[PDB]
Curated annotation (Swiss-Prot), chains A, B:
Name used for this protein in its record: Nectin-4
Disease: Ectodermal dysplasia-syndactyly syndrome 1: A form of ectodermal dysplasia, a heterogeneous group of disorders due to abnormal development of two or more ectodermal structures. EDSS1 is characterized by the association of hair and teeth abnormalities with cutaneous syndactyly of the hands and/or feet. Hair morphologic abnormalities include twists at irregular intervals (pilli torti) and swelling along the shafts, particularly associated with areas of breakage. Dental findings consist of abnormally widely spaced teeth, with peg-shaped and conical crowns. Patients have normal sweating.
Segments forming domain Ig-like V-type: 1-113
Coverage span on the entire protein: 32 to 243 of 510
Organs and tissues of expression: Predominantly expressed in placenta. Not detected in normal breast epithelium but expressed in breast carcinoma.
Length: 215, 215
């Protein structure tokens, strides 16, 4: 008669997170009350909600109006809750404590993973003239968690370098195309293609290159 | 509508400890379930018992047959328990968590103090002869928690020194009487009088001094 729960739950930003906690008990045992706390290492523990065999769900003031029980019918032995509109601030571990009879109490943890897709930018390099050698065409910047994958799709010949800075809860990566300007390159599209887990369609933003004759 | 509890409970060894936890709620609020854990700093937390609005008291396997609810009638809002036969191993702090509606949950701590009275010994010094100068009459040793207070009650003239070693959970104190032997001191009682908080009658054990003539 043990305690079923997920190992790590994954949502994309803005989706509702369903936190699993179902005590798969046999014919002679009931649950008394299920408490959901947030394992906060050093930031105390942040109580989400507790739900009681009789008196229902009491959602905590912090998550007031954010937590609710899954639509019925629900097994009376199930203490799962839904965290509405998941946000980056919710990443981390969560304790599901349950008190059962005649078994005793149990607890299970789970880690919640919030994917945040990027909102990329492209920024053109200097005015490109048919004269000069290797220079900046454009650079393309995407921050998200996990770190997005930024590449270039184009016809023209060129070299890239990139950088990838880990920030507190995400990672910004930037890439940049380099090329020797050629008038043959004018009006030709250079497009930046970013990919992310939280993105079912890879994002693509396009720059139309310009080059002028040596003057 | 707050949560009444004692600040620190005190029992003498072998007595039953009553741990107070009574939610003095007003007309619109009930308790769902009350959990008693032991605040164990680094030794996890040792769950005592939890008692549920419907399903009763579930006492934890560690304290199996040691914990029970106070004789009825008991206010249904009261979660107090009795720890039967208090022992030194029980000294420390205890968390009383309660889950209330529509209030929310509360918790209160208390520190349990177990007084252990001493079982003193007296050990005679060397054979005391009318000849010698300052020497050992006897020494008297008492260990308890808190540290007992050992003194001497007698007719004869003498000096004492004592030592007092703190041990892990108690303190042993020893005292010793000193005197210049005199035949006038033979058959005369030297008695060691120890006092303790956990002792309503001060303990007294008596030694009958001997001294023999220079030979």
């Amino acid at each position: 008669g043990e305690l079923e729960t997920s190992d790590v739950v994954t949502v994309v930003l803005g989706q509702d997170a369903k936190l699993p906690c179902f005590y798969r008990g046999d014919s002679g045992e009931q649950v008394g009350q299920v408490a959901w706390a947030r394992v906060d290492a050093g930031e105390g523990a942040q109580e989400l909600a507790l739900l009681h065999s009789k008196y229902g769900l009491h959602v905590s003031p912090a998550y007031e109006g954010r937590v609710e029980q899954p639509p019925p019918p629900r097994n009376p032995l199930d203490g799962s809750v839904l965290l509405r509109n998941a946000v980056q601030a919710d990443e981390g571990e969560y304790e599901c404590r349950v008190s059962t009879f005649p078994a005793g109490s149990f607890q299970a943890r789970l880690r919640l993973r919030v994917l945040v897709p990027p909102l990329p930018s492209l920024n053109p390099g200097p005015a490109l003239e048919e004269g000069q050698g290797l220079t900046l065409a454009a650079s393309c910047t995407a921050e998200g968690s996990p770190a997005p994958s930024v590449t270039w799709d184009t016809e023209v010949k060129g070299t890239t370098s990139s950088r990838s800075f880990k920030h507190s809860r995400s990672a910004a990566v930037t890439s940049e195309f380099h090329l020797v300007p050629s008038r043959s390159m004018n009006g030709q599209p250079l497009t930046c293609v970013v990919s992310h887990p939280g993105l079912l369609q890879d994002q693509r933003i396009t720059h139309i290159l310009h080059v002028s004759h040596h003057h």
